[PDB]
Ligand code: HEC
Ligand code: HEC
Ligand code: HEC
């Protein structure tokens with residue numbers, strides 16, 4: 001496969017639950033633009049980390065059997081890798097933070113600078 005263009009936006013999967021704000025319903029975050037061209041220095045298989053096992057096809061992260069929970073992140077399941085908050089935050093934030101600490105060009109680490117669309 002080829003990487004999509006830079007107009008690509010990552011959204012929560014259909015059915016995604018948001019944590020309640022007290023006893024009121026939560027809201028999902030704004031969606032996340034993701035430009036592949038700005039990550040052209042990172043091997044595809046770094047992020048698409050099952051690419052070999054998947055026969056070289058790129059599967060969505062939230063594919064059944066992968067990070068396919070629709071549950072929001074709470075105390076109980078905080079370390080469950082199947083949750084979408086955990087899968088994407090671990091991938092996206094951790095690298096941007098590490099690079100910012102080595103004083104390198106990097107991407108957003110603040111909530112509102114990643115979750116920008118909506
Ligand atoms: C992390 C820094 C990434 C690198 C490097 C590459 N990709 Fe990527 N890609 C990444 C994410 C988080 C997503 C969203 C997937 C999701 O399920 O949310 C994508 C998306 C794609 C897709 C589209 C999948 C779809 O919408 O069906 C393709 C085809 C794709 N990526 C291919 C691809 C290639 C070939 C890469 C190397 C050149 C590559 N990606 C790098 C994250 C990252
Ligand atoms: C199924 C075939 C998956 C695809 C597609 C994606 N992920 Fe995944 N991921 C999957 C499993 C079964 C696991 C457990 C560990 C393992 O290697 O078997 C993971 C792990 C992660 C992690 C944690 C990595 C670590 O701690 O070393 C992250 C951050 C992660 N996965 C993110 C992630 C992203 C963003 C994906 C789309 C680009 C993605 N994975 C696809 C299963 C599958
Ligand atoms: C390293 C392994 C990274 C991972 C994983 C992710 N990002 Fe990234 N990002 C990285 C670099 C080195 C840069 C700078 C690119 C440059 O040459 O300037 C970026 C940049 C971004 C940007 C653009 C910010 C801007 O143009 O000002 C975005 C929007 C971004 N990154 C988002 C993003 C997402 C959503 C990620 C997980 C799917 C992700 N990055 C992973 C390095 C790495």
Ligand code: HEC
Nearest residue numbers: 010011012028029031032085088092093108109110111114
């Ligand atoms: C990119 C570098 C991000 C940063 C910084 C933050 N978030 Fe994020 N988050 C990111 C992606 C790619 C995703 C999956 C796509 C989506 O929009 O769901 C997420 C997901 C979440 C979620 C789960 C889904 C939702 O409820 O909308 C939450 C609750 C969440 N993100 C919150 C959040 C907070 C509070 C942040 C700052 C501390 C934050 N995100 C930063 C990518 C990135």
